[PDB]
Amino acid sequence: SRKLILFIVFLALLLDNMLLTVVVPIIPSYLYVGLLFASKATVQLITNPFIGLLTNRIGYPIPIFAGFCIMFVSTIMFAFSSSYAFLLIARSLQGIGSSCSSVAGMGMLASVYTDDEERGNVMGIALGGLAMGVLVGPPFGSVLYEFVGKTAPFLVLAALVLLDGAIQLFVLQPSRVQPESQKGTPLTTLLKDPYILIAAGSICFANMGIAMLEPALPIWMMETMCSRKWQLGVAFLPASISYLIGTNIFGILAHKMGRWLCALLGMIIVGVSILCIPFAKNIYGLIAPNFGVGFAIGMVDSSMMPIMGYLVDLRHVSVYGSVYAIADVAFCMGYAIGPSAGGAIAKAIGFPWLMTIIGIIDILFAPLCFFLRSPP
Numbered sequence: 001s002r003k004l005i006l007f008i009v010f011l012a013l014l015l016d017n018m019l020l021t022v023v024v025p026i027i028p029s030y031l032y033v034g035l036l037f038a039s040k041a042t043v044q045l046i047t048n049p050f051i052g053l054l055t056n057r058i059g060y061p062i063p064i065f066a067g068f069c070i071m072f073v074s075t076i077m078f079a080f081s082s083s084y085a086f087l088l089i090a091r092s093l094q095g096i097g098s099s100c101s102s103v104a105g106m107g108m109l110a111s112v113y114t115d116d117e118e119r120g121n122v123m124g125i126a127l128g129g130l131a132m133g134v135l136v137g138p139p140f141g142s143v144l145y146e147f148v149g150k151t152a153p154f155l156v157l158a159a160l161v162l163l164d165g166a167i168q169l170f171v172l173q174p175s176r177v178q179p180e181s182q183k184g185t186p187l188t189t190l191l192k193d194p195y196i197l198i199a200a201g202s203i204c205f206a207n208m209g210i211a212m213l214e215p216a217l218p219i220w221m222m223e224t225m226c227s228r229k230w231q232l233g234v235a236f237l238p239a240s241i242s243y244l245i246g247t248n249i250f251g252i253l254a255h256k257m258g259r260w261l262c263a264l265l266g267m268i269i270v271g272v273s274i275l276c277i278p279f280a281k282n283i284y285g286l287i288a289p290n291f292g293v294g295f296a297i298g299m300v301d302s303s304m305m306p307i308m309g310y311l312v313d314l315r316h317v318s319v320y321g322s323v324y325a326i327a328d329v330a331f332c333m334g335y336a337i338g339p340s341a342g343g344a345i346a347k348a349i350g351f352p353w354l355m356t357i358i359g360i361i362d363i364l365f366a367p368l369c370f371f372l373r374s375p376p
């Protein structure tokens with residue numbers, strides 16, 4: 001019964017992303033900044049190779065259990081810490097624990113579900129845990145912040161974090177270090193492969209699109225359309241709901257459609273949607289492009305996550321910690337320098353021109369995905 005491992009990875013991703021999306025609106029309010037926001041992604045980017053090597057020395061369960069212990073301490077510190085230095089330390093600890101959870105859980109899903117289609121299906125659900133977490137983070141945080149108090153959301157998360165830990169002690173039960181069998185291809189060998197580079201680049205550019213869109217779209221809104229406070233929250237809501245739907249459907253569906261074709265169509269759709277965003281004049285005109293952006297990024301992510309495991313299964317040694325380190329690096333590159341570069345370029349040349357540049361880059365990189373098809 002490997003469904004318990006799937007449940008634990010689903011819950012770990014869900015709770016990690018709930019914490020990630022809950023800490024966002026509260027802290028500026030609690031403190032009343034870019035380095036604090038980017039510290040999690042930077043630390044995760046730095047420690048991804050080390051976790052990729054460590055899971056090959058001691059196994060997956062011990063790094064996964066430590067992810068809960070660091071997550072529990074990070075959650076407890078988040079509840080009581082009121083200093084910027086301690087918030088930064090907690091954020092970086094969350095980065096280390098999220099690196100452990102992401103890399104080791106994706107590796108254990110890939111090593112437990114070795115089927116090519118079941119792997120896509122179960123990473124569809126697991127990434128759907130991430131989508132559900134990003135969906136219900138802000139609402140849960142806001143309601144429990146208004147009703148009970150500032151530290152109430154952190155304590156409830158801490159209770160389920162402990163409960164995930166009890167199942168983790170019951171079945172993961174990592175009493176002792178057990179070494180893996182075979183040595184993975186060095187990271188340098190992995191980084192010379194052009195197709196792994198193309199897959200990572202597609203993930204990086206598609207995700208950097210949304211990473212620079214999400215904090216810069218309201219900046220355009222308050223100056224052009226003068227939207228009210230709730231409209232900003234509801235404007236990006238179709239993106240999140242469509243990301244949930246796209247992840248859950250396309251984890252199942254992209255194998256039949258074709259992962260290369262699904263990625264290419266997602267790249268074109270996100271490029272055209274980003275190109276059409278500057279033409280919109282009101283929220284009803286933004287419902288369709290945001291839905292398309294989220295839908296297409298769901299296609300791309302749910303099609304390129306299993307392809308990273310497929311690439312090493314085809315070309316290299318089948319150890320997944322180190323290649324999912326690269327896959328997570330692709331995300332962290334977009335999510336680390338995203339807001340800063342987006343703001344800088346928007347101030348320099350303009351927001352519509354920035355989005356046109358993103359669309360052109362996406363559209364021109366889309367033909368590169370043609371090489372990802374299987375030779376037969």
Ligand SMILES: C[n+]1ccc(-c2ccccc2)cc1
Pocket residue numbers: 130134207210239240243294297301331
């Ligand atoms: C890794 N990853 C995190 C978040 C998203 C996301 C998707 C839609 C809306 C907001 C965030 C996508 C991928």
